[PDB]
Amino acid sequence: EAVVISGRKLAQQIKQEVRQEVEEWVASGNKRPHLSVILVGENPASHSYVLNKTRAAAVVGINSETIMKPASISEEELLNLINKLNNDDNVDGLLVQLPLPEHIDERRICNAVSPDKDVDGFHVINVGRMCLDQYSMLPATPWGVWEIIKRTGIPTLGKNVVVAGRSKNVGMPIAMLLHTDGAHERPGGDATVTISHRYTPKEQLKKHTILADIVISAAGIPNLITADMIKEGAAVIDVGINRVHKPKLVGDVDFEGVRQKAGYITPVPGGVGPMTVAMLMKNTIIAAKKVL
Amino acid sequence: EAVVISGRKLAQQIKQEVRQEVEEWVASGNKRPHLSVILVGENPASHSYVLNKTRAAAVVGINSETIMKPASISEEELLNLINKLNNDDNVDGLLVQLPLPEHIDERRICNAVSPDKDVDGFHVINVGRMCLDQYSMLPATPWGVWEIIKRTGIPTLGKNVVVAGRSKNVGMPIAMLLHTDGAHERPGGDATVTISHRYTPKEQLKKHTILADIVISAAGIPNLITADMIKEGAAVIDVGINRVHKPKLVGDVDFEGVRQKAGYITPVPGGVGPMTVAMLMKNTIIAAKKVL
Ligand SMILES: NC(=O)c1ccc[n+]([C@@H]2O[C@H](COP(=O)([O-])OP(=O)(O)OC[C@H]3O[C@@H](n4cnc5c(N)ncnc54)[C@H](O)[C@@H]3O)[C@@H](O)[C@H]2O)c1
Ligand SMILES: NC(=O)c1ccc[n+]([C@@H]2O[C@H](COP(=O)([O-])OP(=O)(O)OC[C@H]3O[C@@H](n4cnc5c(N)ncnc54)[C@H](O)[C@@H]3O)[C@@H](O)[C@H]2O)c1
Numbered sequence: 001e002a003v004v005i006s007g008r009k010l011a012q013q014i015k016q017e018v019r020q021e022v023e024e025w026v027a028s029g030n031k032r033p034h035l036s037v038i039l040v041g042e043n044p045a046s047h048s049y050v051l052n053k054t055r056a057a058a059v060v061g062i063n064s065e066t067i068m069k070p071a072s073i074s075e076e077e078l079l080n081l082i083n084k085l086n087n088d089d090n091v092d093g094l095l096v097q098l099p100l101p102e103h104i105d106e107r108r109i110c111n112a113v114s115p116d117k118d119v120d121g122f123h124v125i126n127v128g129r130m131c132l133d134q135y136s137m138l139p140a141t142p143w144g145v146w147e148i149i150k151r152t153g154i155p156t157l158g159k160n161v162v163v164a165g166r167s168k169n170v171g172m173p174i175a176m177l178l179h180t181d182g183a184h185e186r187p188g189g190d191a192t193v194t195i196s197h198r199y200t201p202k203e204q205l206k207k208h209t210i211l212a213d214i215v216i217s218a219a220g221i222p223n224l225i226t227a228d229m230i231k232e233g234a235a236v237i238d239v240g241i242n243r244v245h246k247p248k249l250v251g252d253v254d255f256e257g258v259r260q261k262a263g264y265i266t267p268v269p270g271g272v273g274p275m276t277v278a279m280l281m282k283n284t285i286i287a288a289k290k291v292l
Numbered sequence: 293e294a295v296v297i298s299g300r301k302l303a304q305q306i307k308q309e310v311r312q313e314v315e316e317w318v319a320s321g322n323k324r325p326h327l328s329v330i331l332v333g334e335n336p337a338s339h340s341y342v343l344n345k346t347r348a349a350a351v352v353g354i355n356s357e358t359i360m361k362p363a364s365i366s367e368e369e370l371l372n373l374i375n376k377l378n379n380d381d382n383v384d385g386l387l388v389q390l391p392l393p394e395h396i397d398e399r400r401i402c403n404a405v406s407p408d409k410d411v412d413g414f415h416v417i418n419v420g421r422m423c424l425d426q427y428s429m430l431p432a433t434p435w436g437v438w439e440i441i442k443r444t445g446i447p448t449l450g451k452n453v454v455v456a457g458r459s460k461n462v463g464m465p466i467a468m469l470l471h472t473d474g475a476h477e478r479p480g481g482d483a484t485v486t487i488s489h490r491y492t493p494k495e496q497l498k499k500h501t502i503l504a505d506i507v508i509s510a511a512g513i514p515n516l517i518t519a520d521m522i523k524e525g526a527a528v529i530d531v532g533i534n535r536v537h538k539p540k541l542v543g544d545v546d547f548e549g550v551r552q553k554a555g556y557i558t559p560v561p562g563g564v565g566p567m568t569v570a571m572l573m574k575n576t577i578i579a580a581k582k583v584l
């Protein structure tokens with residue numbers, strides 16, 4: 001029997017910490033932090049995630065606004081709005097919820113957010129700084145993943161990690177953080193990391209996952225990770241979010257099988273999800289204190 | 293018997309290509325490209341590598357200057373020089389040979405070179421763009437490594453690659469290029485990539501290298517890769533440079549053992565080295581054409 005790690009309980013801890021930090025920033029005479037979120041269009045999951053973010057902000061004492069725009073907004077208009085928010089000193093953190101309409105170039109939009117306000121860590125400079133193991137705004141999900149590992153007390157240094165997924169927002173940063181030097185300006189995990197993706201044959205995925213002390217799945221494929229792929233005692237972190245069949249939410253991991261073989265496992269929901277939102281809270285206070 | 297790939301012969305091909313490109317740029321009325329190299333101090337290997345670079349430039353029709361400064365140069369003075377070269381339009385490519393004296397912060401210096409002239413690809417924006425699979429100035433050694441693989445006709449897509457070394461100038465870019473999507477703006481190799489480093493136990497290094505179709509060693513450890521670590525038919529690319537014992541130059545690979553087990557192997561010297569210099573030539577014409 002795997003220890004089922006509650007990301008909900010961890011996220012509550014992290015939110016207690018942020019509330020304190022925030023209550024102590026404000027207590028000492030500084031402006032309350034303010035997070036602005038641009039939400040374009042009518043995607044329900046997008047609306048639900050933004051709502052989780054604004055509730056979390058309210059519970060740790062961070063002001064938030066949700067700026068709603070229709071999917072018909074031009075790229076030029078959204079960029080204008082971004083420039084206006086970058087230049088407002090009341091605004092500490094700025095994120096644009098993805099995905100955006102097809103007619104809008106997401107890379108351009110992310111690179112328009114000011115790096116000092118880029119609480120998603122998607123701006124190219126934040127990406128470059130992370131890749132160079134310098135202080136940066138880390139993306140929220142990857143940082144959530146590392147915090148689950150670190151706060152549970154699961155070792156990384158010299159350990160074998162497999163990451164299924166190579167996406168610039170999730171997979172790549174997870175791999176980058178976990179493999180890098182603990183002695184650098186931004187310390188990494190010092191793990192031996194294998195990056196797998198859509199062209200990794202299932203056969204080769206299994207031959208690597210079977211050596212792994214930690215397996216992190218961020219592919220968006222149900223049952224991609226099964227018991228026979230895991231060594232006994234492994235930590236299994238499920239970042240996937242998959243709508244399957246009424247519509248239902250599952251992870252990338254066969255939870256019921258793998259919970260009999262792994263030492264640690266995260267559920268979906270209730271695992272990495274809440275951690276994603278908590279770490280965003282942390283980045284907002286960091287942007288407000290202007291410590292980068 | 294492994295095919296011993298001559299990086300010398302490949303580099304000559306690449307240099308023939310660059311000469312043509314350059315002869316055709318100039319032929320059409322543009323300024324001859326100009327590469328400036330700042331060399332600080334008296335390190336002999338540094339002097340020898342810069343000399344390889346300026347000879348290569350002369351053979352492909354690129355003007356070069358070597359700017360020599362003493363190890364006593366302040367950081368402020370070197371940065372001044374860099375600003376002056378950034379702002380001169382005769383100068384197309386600008387690199388600072390590393391390493392620098394301890395009193396100088398290399399990250400600051402690399403980030404002062406203008407991205408459009410950063411023919412080493414060390415500037416944070418070039419690093420960020422590479423990490424996001426966008427067009428960037430690629431670092432010369434990593435690109436050399438990928439060119440050896442691609443020009444020999446060794447497949448990467450779906451293949452297992454191990455990289456021994458995680459350095460921001462060599463190991464990390466090699467891993468990044470090889471793992472990434474062939475369908476992105478800057479195409480990657482679509483390989484399954486394992487990053488190993490100084491905290492990977494030898495035991496775990498072997499268990500991954502033994503699955504590898506390609507093993508790329510960039511650790512600076514003699515005999516780090518031996519025959520029993522390699523599967524039969526594997527491609528073995530030796531990026532290491534090690535002074536051993538008169539003083540002698542060897543790679544990270546036990547060449548004599550591994551040439552009996554691998555399908556392909558690169559020697560040291562004569563492998564990745566000349567490729568490092570040729571690809572720098574390629575980046576110089578790219579900076580001159582202002583195509584990024
Ligand atoms: N829980 C959270 O907080 C959270 C946050 C962000 C994203 N996600 C989820 O993580 C998953 C990935 O999100 P993303 O934005 O990185 O998505 P994406 O669709 O860009 O990435 C999918 C990645 O998985 C890889 N992949 C596809 N098939 C594979 C296979 N057979 N083996 C290994 N890798 C394979 C792809 O190569 C790609 O890199 C999704 O299910 C998404 O909903 C969860
Ligand atoms: N042929 C060329 O053109 C060329 C160009 C650049 C560098 N190099 C050579 O490549 C080697 C590395 O250069 P660098 O600048 O990346 O050096 P570096 O010293 O910064 O990097 C060494 C890397 O190897 C790793 N390492 C150390 N012990 C290890 C082990 N037992 N297993 C796996 N990895 C281990 C370290 O963690 C580190 O990431 C050196 O020998 C250098 O001279 C060659």
Ligand SMILES: Nc1nc(O)c2c(n1)NC[C@@H]1CN(c3ccc(C(=O)N[C@@H](CCC(=O)O)C(=O)O)cc3)C(=O)N21
Pocket residue numbers: 048049052095096097098099120140141241249268269270271272273274276277
């Ligand atoms: N700019 C930007 N930043 C982000 O960090 C994200 C983004 N866009 N778009 C989509 C992803 C996904 N994501 C996210 C956030 C929260 C949760 C979450 O709270 N999950 C819960 C509820 C599951 C549900 O009912 O949908 C869970 O327990 O897993 C899931 C994804 C998120 O916020 N993402």
Ligand SMILES: Nc1nc(O)c2c(n1)NC[C@@H]1CN(c3ccc(C(=O)N[C@@H](CCC(=O)O)C(=O)O)cc3)C(=O)N21
Pocket residue numbers: 340341344387388389390391412432433533541560561562563564565566568569
């Ligand atoms: N800024 C900057 N850019 C670089 O790309 C480098 C740098 N600094 N500092 C050191 C590394 C190493 N390096 C390099 C360049 C050429 C050769 C090379 O030509 N090697 C030959 C000769 C070996 C010898 O006799 O020393 C070989 O055949 O391997 C080796 C390393 C190089 O140029 N490097």
